C-alpha cells in the first residue's frame, strides 16, 4: 500500500512497479528511531526501516549535476549488465570452477564516462543496464566531504557502541538505473542500507530459511548467493523454494534499513522509477561469546566444514563427492 | 579350493561349511614370511596371510581341556547371541541413541562356567552362540605364560620396527563355536590375526569400498560397522552394496592374517567345524607425515566432521539434519 507523499505529490509508487513473484510476503516495520520498539529489533537482530535518522540528510540533496559536479576526478568501479539481474562474483574464485561464465562486467571509469553511457541509453532505449557500487575514500572534492561530515554520526556510533558491534568496515554509494534487480545473497556483517534518491524494493528472508534458498557452494564464485533463479524458479531443483516466507518494504528518501547480520536480501530499484542512490554502511558484528544454537550459527558452521573439506582434500571439486559418500544410505 | 593336511588326514574344510553370500571375491595371497612379497605387501598396507611365522607355535597345542586347566582363576569376559551375527558395540554410546535395541551380551564368568554352558549346548542341541572376546592379563598361570613367553616375539617386534608402527596395543584371546560370524567392521589399528585351533573364513574389503559397505553414523553404537545385513541386503537402502568386491581367506592352525588399518573384515567359524581360537596382536600404526590422497586419510576426514558436528550442535541426533540442509540441491 503505498505512500502518501507531502503537499499531495501524489503516491509515493505504486504495484506496477514491482516484479512479481511466487512466494508470500509480511512488511518490515517502520519505526521512529526514538521508538522502543525499533530499538527492541536491532538489538534482536530482526530488520526494521527507521524513517526519521537524518543520518544521511545533507546528501538527500544529491542528484546526477550536483555529483558530476563536486565528486571530484578518481576512479569509480561501475559494474555491467545483460538483463535485469546483476549476479556479482569473487574474482579470486574462478581458478575453482573453471567453466564459469560471467554475465557481469566491471569497468573502471570516471563519473562523467558513466553519466554519459547512462544518458545515451536514456536518449537512444537500450537494453543494457549499469550499476556502481563504488567505495567511499579520499579523493572526494570539498563540498561532497562538507555532506559526509554531515552525516548523523553521533547517531550511528551510538547505534555501534549499545550493539557491541565491531568497527565501520565501508561505505558503498550505490546508483544505479530503474528496473534493476540485486539477487539474493547475504552478508556476514550487519548492515544500514541508507536511502537517497529513488525508491528501491527490499525483500528479505531470515537465516533459517537457507534450506529453502540454496546458496552456491562456498567456493563457487557465486557464494552467499542464492541459486534459484526468482523470475522463473525450478521447483524440481529446488523444492523448498516452495516453502519460502518474505519480508518486504520499499525503502526512499530519507529512510534507513537494518539489513541484520546473515539476512539473505533481494533488491530491486522500481521500474519507471527513474535512477536510485543509496549508501550503506557496513559494521562487523560483535564477536561470539550457548544451547539452543541460533540459525546464523548453523550457517556459520556449515560454511567452516565446507572450507575444511577444502584444504584437507586439495581440491574443492571433491567437497561434493566426500558429502555425498558421507550420508548416502548412512544420514538420509 | 581347500588345503589338503599332511599324512593324508584328508582336506581342510569344504564349500559347504562357508556361508553363501552374493558378492564375489578375490583370494589373498598366502605366503611364506622370508618371501618379499609378503613383505611388499605389508609395507603397501596390503593383506597377507603367512602361513610360517611360528608366531604363536606354543599355542598349537591350547585346546579345552588344558586351557580350563592352566589358564587360572581371573575374569574372562563372554559375550552372548540370539542368532548366528555376533553385532557388538560401544557401551558409552546408548546414551546417543535412545531407542536402542542390543542382540548381545557380555557376561563376566569363569573359564569353566563358560565350558559348561558350551558343553551342555554341546549335548543338549540349543540355538544360542557364544564368544571369548578376552584380553590378555596378568592373572594367568604359569604353563600358559611360559608358553606365551614362548611366540616370535624377534619376528613381531621387528615387523613393527621396519613398518614404524607404535607400540602394542592388545591381546585379545578368542573363543567360539562353530558357524559363530562377526559382520563386517574396521578398526583403526594395524592387526595380526594369529588362527591357533578350528578355521576362520575371512571377507575383507579395501577403505576405498567405504561407499558400498555403509557404516552406522560415527555416534551410533554400532559405529564403525556396516549396517547391510549380508545374509539379506537391503538393495533399496544399500544399492551400491551390488558393486563390492571381497578379498577372501580360510585360515587354520598357525596361519597368521594381516588385516591392515581401515580394511573391512566379516570373520565365519566355519560350519559343522567345531570349535576356534585365535589370538590377534594390535598395533596403533605410524603416526602421520601428500595428495592423491589414500582412500584411508578420506575416511579419517569424514570420521572427524562427524565428530566436530557433534561437539559444535551440542546433539548427535542433529548431525544428520544439517548435513542434508547443506548438500540438497547445493552438492547432489
Ligand atoms: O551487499 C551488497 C553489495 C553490493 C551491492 C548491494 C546492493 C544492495 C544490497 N547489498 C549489496
Ligand atoms: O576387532 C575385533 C574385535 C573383537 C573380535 C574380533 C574378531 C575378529 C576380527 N576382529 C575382531
Ligand atoms: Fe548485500
Ligand atoms: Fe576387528
Given at each position: 500500500?503505498?505512500?502518501?507523499?507531502?503537499?499531495?505529490?501524489?503516491?509515493?509508487?505504486?504495484?506496477?512497479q514491482?516484479?512479481?513473484?511466487?512466494?508470500?510476503?509480511?512488511?518490515?516495520?517502520?519505526?521512529?528511531?526514538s521508538?522502543?520498539?525499533?530499538?527492541?529489533?536491532?538489538?534482536?537482530?530482526?530488520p526494521?526501516?527507521?524513517?526519521?535518522?537524518?543520518?544521511?540528510?545533507?546528501?538527500?540533496?544529491?542528484?546526477?549535476?550536483?555529483?558530476?559536479?563536486?565528486?571530484?576526478?578518481?576512479?569509480?568501479?561501475?559494474?555491467?549488465?545483460?538483463?535485469?539481474?546483476?549476479?556479482?562474483?569473487?574474482?579470486?574464485?574462478?581458478?575453482?570452477?573453471?567453466?564459469?561464465?560471467?554475465?557481469?562486467?566491471?569497468?573502471?571509469?570516471?563519473?562523467?564516462?558513466?553519466?554519459?553511457?547512462?544518458?545515451?541509453?536514456?536518449?537512444?532505449?537500450?537494453?543494457?543496464?549499469?550499476?556502481?557500487?563504488?567505495?567511499?575514500?579520499?579523493?572526494?572534492?570539498?563540498?561532497?566531504?562538507?555532506?559526509?561530515?554531515?552525516?548523523?554520526?553521533?547517531?550511528?556510533?551510538?547505534?555501534?557502541?549499545?550493539?557491541?558491534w565491531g568497527?565501520?568496515?565501508?561505505?558503498?554509494l550505490?546508483?544505479?538505473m530503474?528496473?534493476?534487480?540485486?539477487?539474493?545473497?547475504?552478508?556476514?556483517?550487519?548492515?544500514?542500507?541508507?536511502?537517497?534518491?529513488?525508491?528501491?524494493?527490499?525483500?528479505?528472508?531470515?537465516?533459517?530459511?537457507?534450506?529453502?534458498?540454496?546458496?552456491?557452494?562456498?567456493?563457487?564464485?557465486?557464494?552467499?548467493?542464492?541459486?534459484?533463479?526468482?523470475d522463473?524458479?525450478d521447483?524440481?531443483?529446488?523444492?523448498?523454494?516452495?516453502?519460502?516466507?518474505?519480508?518486504?518494504?520499499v525503502?526512499?528518501?530519507?529512510?534507513?534499513?537494518y539489513?541484520?547480520?546473515?539476512?539473505?536480501?533481494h533488491?530491486?530499484?522500481?521500474?519507471?522509477?527513474?535512477?536510485?542512490?543509496?549508501?550503506?554502511?557496513?559494521?562487523?558484528?560483535?564477536?561470539?561469546?550457548?544451547?539452543?544454537?541460533?540459525?546464523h550459527?548453523?550457517?556459520?558452521?556449515?560454511?567452516?566444514?565446507?572450507?575444511?573439506?577444502?584444504?584437507?582434500?586439495?581440491?574443492?571439486?571433491?567437497?561434493?563427492?566426500?558429502?555425498?559418500?558421507?550420508?548416502?544410505?548412512?544420514?538420509?
Amino acid at each position: 500500500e503505498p505512500r502518501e507523499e507531502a503537499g499531495a505529490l501524489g503516491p509515493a509508487w505504486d504495484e506496477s512497479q514491482l516484479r512479481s513473484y511466487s512466494f508470500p510476503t509480511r512488511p518490515i516495520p517502520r519505526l521512529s528511531q526514538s521508538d522502543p520498539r525499533a530499538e527492541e529489533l536491532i538489538e534482536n537482530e530482526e530488520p526494521v526501516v527507521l524513517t526519521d535518522t537524518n543520518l544521511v540528510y545533507p546528501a538527500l540533496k544529491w542528484d546526477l549535476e550536483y555529483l558530476q559536479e563536486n565528486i571530484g576526478n578518481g576512479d569509480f568501479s561501475v559494474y555491467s549488465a545483460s538483463t535485469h539481474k546483476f549476479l556479482y562474483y569473487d574474482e579470486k574464485k574462478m581458478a575453482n570452477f573453471q567453466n564459469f561464465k560471467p554475465r557481469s562486467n566491471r569497468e573502471e571509469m570516471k563519473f562523467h564516462e558513466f553519466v554519459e553511457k547512462l544518458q545515451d541509453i536514456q536518449q537512444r532505449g537500450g537494453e543494457e543496464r549499469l550499476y556502481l557500487q563504488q567505495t567511499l575514500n579520499d579523493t572526494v572534492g570539498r563540498k561532497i566531504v562538507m555532506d559526509f561530515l554531515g552525516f548523523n554520526w553521533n547517531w550511528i556510533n551510538k547505534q555501534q557502541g549499545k550493539r557491541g558491534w565491531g568497527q565501520l568496515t565501508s561505505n558503498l554509494l550505490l546508483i544505479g538505473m530503474e528496473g534493476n534487480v540485486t539477487p539474493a545473497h547475504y552478508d556476514e556483517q550487519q548492515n544500514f542500507f541508507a536511502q537517497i534518491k529513488g525508491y528501491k524494493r527490499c525483500i528479505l528472508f531470515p537465516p533459517d530459511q537457507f534450506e529453502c534458498l540454496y546458496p552456491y557452494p562456498v567456493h563457487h564464485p557465486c557464494d552467499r548467493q542464492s541459486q534459484v533463479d526468482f523470475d522463473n524458479p525450478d521447483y524440481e531443483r529446488f523444492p523448498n523454494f516452495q516453502n519460502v516466507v518474505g519480508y518486504e518494504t520499499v525503502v526512499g528518501p530519507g529512510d534507513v534499513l537494518y539489513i541484520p547480520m546473515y539476512w539473505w536480501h533481494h533488491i530491486e530499484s522500481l521500474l519507471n522509477g527513474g535512477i536510485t542512490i543509496t549508501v550503506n554502511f557496513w559494521y562487523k558484528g560483535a564477536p561470539t561469546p550457548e544451547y539452543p544454537l541460533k540459525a546464523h550459527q548453523k550457517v556459520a558452521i556449515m560454511r567452516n566444514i565446507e572450507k575444511m573439506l577444502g584444504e584437507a582434500l586439495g581440491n574443492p571439486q571433491e567437497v561434493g563427492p566426500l558429502l555425498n559418500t558421507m550420508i548416502k544410505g548412512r544420514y538420509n
